[PDB]
């Protein structure tokens, strides 16, 4: 057999990626999307839930945005963010123009760092390339329900 080896990290060449480019200051606008599935056909898709121009502004099931309000978060969320960010994977200064390349490099770094198993790469790659709708199409969909992916793809 052709033996698959183990990775190893040594950051002597980390110094060899530090640009000196002062980037500049910019405002941000945050948009959150998650996997769901519409009712007419059992097909998963990403749907947005809220935006963060100034304050958290959520999107209802009827498709209308509500009032801005202060941002309150939950404690279990902060625990899991600290745990997964302490041992997370970072990719800085990617040189891309399309999402597929970002996905492929993310998968290569996942396999490289033993984050996910190689046999799951195809299903998640199929997931990350579905169509991304917007606020105008929701009334065309007739309602959506949250869905979770499976190994068989059903």
């Amino acid at each position: 057999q052709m033996e698959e080896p183990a990775a190893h990290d040594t950051e002597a060449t980390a110094t060899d990626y530090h640009t000196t480019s002062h980037p500049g200051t910019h405002k941000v606008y945050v948009e959150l999307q998650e996997l769901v599935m519409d009712e007419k056909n059992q097909e998963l898709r990403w749907m947005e839930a809220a935006r963060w121009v100034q304050l958290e502004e959520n999107l209802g099931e009827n498709g209308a945005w509500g009032r801005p309000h202060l941002s309150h978060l939950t404690f279990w969320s902060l625990l899991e963010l600290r745990r997964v960010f302490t041992k997370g994977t970072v990719l800085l200064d990617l040189q891309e123009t399309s999402l597929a390349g970002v996905a492929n490099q993310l998968l290569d770094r996942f396999i490289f760092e033993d984050q996910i198993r190689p046999q799951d790469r195809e299903e998640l790659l199929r997931a990350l390339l579905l169509k991304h709708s917007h606020a105008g199409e929701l009334e065309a969909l007739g309602g959506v329900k949250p869905a979770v992916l499976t190994r068989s793809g059903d």
Binding site: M2, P5, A6, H8, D9, T15, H18, T19, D108
Partner: protein, 581 residues
């Protein structure tokens, strides 16, 4: 021809304006301002202006297109090292098309304070060469004298040019030691390839770097066959890198456009056209005489003795400055441009030019041997060499033969004493005699350094007559071959599995196998993997999986380190095509 702007297409809320540029303008960060008769002047944005080899009327103009893509648009180059008998290329990535490199180059330019003479490439090239030579003499640290093999994997690994540029400007990375001082030319070539000036990097084997103005070189040798003392003002280096740029010279007399060599001097730099170097016109530029003397000058060798009296010795003539080569266009192979630098030796024309330069400068063995040695010797291996001896005298003769082997740096610096052997022979009856002797690494006295080349010298002293014969040869060390298995064409956004195979030719088991893969447009930064021990009989074959992302022509490189050696590199190219619609 002059600055102009037309508003070609008009919309009720929009104009489309076509700005035009002059052929001779200063480069740098510009800013556009709009001033109507009423309002204050308004800033519209910023841009930068560079040279174009595509315009016919500009001074710096190249006719061929593929030469442009090779000398200006390419990023993945090769640099050839080793002896002229076996030359090994090493893959390099200039990375001239990063974001901050152009601004760095302009920041280097702005210490000149002569703005308008920035419109011409001659002055910019000369100033940038001078400043970069000063910066290399500033920020280059000498090598650590102590032996550190465990960190020798880190001292002499190179990743490219931009880290070296960053550490030279700021000093916030690894320094570049005296073992590899030849990068400077490549750095300058990178800067010109950033700026718009076409350029390439040539390598001259067996160059006489040192003092110039004289066409004679002295060398001192031991009684035993070594070099007493270390160093010299003018010595023959093993190789030397240089930079060529393509432009036209209006300030010179007519008939000298084209390639020029960039030569810094110990500060004022200058550039010289290659036809000027070949023809030999000394009074055309103060630097032509020394560089042309650096190519075709002859050496004499002296024999030191116990008394201190130096003796001339009869040796075979060796050549200087041969087999200059560079990277070919549209491929990954070497090409020699030496016919553009010298006439064929032994022509009427070369004798004429030699007589002319000598006329300009005038105003200012009863026995012998010869040596046959292989061009390459394997590491942890052995070889055979042969020395023949022919005498011309009716009487018999006694002779003492000495043989010396020692390592030497790439700039004539002595590195290590390795082996010596002395024996007595008696030649008779005017008959030739051949002596074949092996060379095993186990018989040596020391382990060679990381980057060195062995110099084998032979000295035959006649017992009766003090006139002695001498010969020398240089041998580079070759490493085992690294097989790369990969299909030729690949589709974008598709998985691709490459294979790398290595056979343990060495007589020792390998430990701490650490390899690393990288490539631009294939992997984001770098990777690394570890392995088990490899015994001297078995091999190791491995496979990696990636996916190409950027369409076109790429190449990837792998680099292996272990306990016997470090920084063993190899590369392989690939052409990736767009996916089918």
């Amino acid at each position: 021809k002059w600055w102009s702007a037309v508003v070609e297409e008009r919309d009720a809320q929009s104009w489309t304006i076509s700005v035009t540029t002059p052929a001779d303008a200063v480069i740098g960060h510009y800013s556009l301002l709009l001033q109507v008769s009423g309002r204050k002047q308004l800033l519209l944005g910023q841009f930068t202006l560079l040279f174009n080899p595509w315009n016919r009327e500009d001074a710096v103009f190249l006719k061929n297109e593929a030469q442009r893509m090779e000398y200006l648009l390419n990023q993945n180059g090769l640099i050839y090292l080793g002896t002229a008998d076996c030359i090994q290329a090493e893959s390099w990535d200039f990375g001239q098309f990063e974001g901050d490199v152009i601004d760095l180059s302009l920041r280097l330019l702005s210490k000149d304070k002569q703005v308008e003479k920035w419109s011409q490439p001659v002055h910019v090239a000369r100033v940038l060469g001078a400043l970069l030579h000063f910066l290399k003499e500033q920020r280059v640290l000498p090598t650590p004298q102590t032996q550190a093999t465990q960190e020798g994997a880190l001292l002499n690994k190179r990743r490219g040019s931009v880290p070296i540029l960053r550490q030279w400007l700021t000093g916030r990375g690894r320094p570049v030691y005296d073992g590899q001082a030849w990068v400077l030319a490549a750095v300058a070539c990178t800067v010109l390839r950033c700026l718009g000036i076409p350029a390439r990097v040539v390598t001259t084997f067996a160059s006489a770097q040192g003092t110039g103005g004289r066409l004679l070189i002295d060398e001192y040798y031991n009684e035993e066959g070594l070099q007493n003392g270390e160093g010299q003002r003018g010595r023959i280096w093993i190789f030397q890198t240089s930079t060529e740029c393509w432009m036209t010279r209006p300030a010179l007399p007519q008939g000298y456009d084209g390639w020029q060599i960039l030569h810094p001097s110990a500060g004022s730099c200058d550039l010289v056209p290659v036809r000027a170097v070949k023809e030999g016109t000394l009074g055309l530029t103060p630097a032509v005489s020394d560089l042309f003397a650096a190519i075709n000058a002859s050496c004499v060798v002296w024999k030191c003795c116990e008394d201190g009296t130096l003796e001339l010795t009869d040796s075979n003539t060796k050549y200087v400055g041969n087999n200059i080569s560079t990277k070919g266009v549209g491929s990954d192979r070497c090409e020699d441009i030496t016919q553009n630098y010298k006439y064929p030796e032994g022509s009427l024309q070369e004798k004429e030019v030699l007589e002319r330069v000598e006329k300009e400068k005038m105003e200012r063995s009863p026995l012998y041997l010869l040596l046959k040695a292989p061009s390459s010797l394997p590491l942890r291996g052995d070889a055979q060499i042969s020395v023949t001896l022919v005498n011309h005298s009716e009487q018999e003769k006694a002779v003492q033969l000495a043989i010396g082997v020692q390592a030497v740096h790439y700039n004539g610096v002595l590195a290590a004493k390795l082996w010596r052997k002395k024996l007595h022979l008696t030649l008779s009856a005017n008959l030739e005699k051949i002596i074949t002797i092996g060379l095993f690494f186990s018989n040596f006295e020391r382990n060679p350094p990381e980057n060195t080349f062995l110099r084998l010298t032979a000295m035959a002293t006649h017992s009766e007559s003090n006139l002695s014969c001498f010969a020398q040869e240089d041998i580079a060390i070759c490493r085992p071959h690294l097989a790369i298995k990969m299909p030729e064409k690949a589709e974008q956004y598709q998985p691709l599995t490459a294979s790398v195979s290595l056979q343990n030719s060495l007589d020792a088991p390998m430990e701490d196998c650490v390899i690393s893969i990288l490539g631009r447009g294939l992997i984001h930064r770098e990777r690394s993997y570890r392995f088990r021990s490899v015994w001297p009989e078995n091999t190791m074959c491995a496979k990696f999986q990636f996916t190409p992302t950027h369409v076109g022509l790429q190449r990837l490189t792998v680099e292996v380190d272990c306990n016997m050696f470090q920084n063993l590199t190899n590369y392989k190219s690939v052409t990736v095509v767009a996916p089918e619609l």
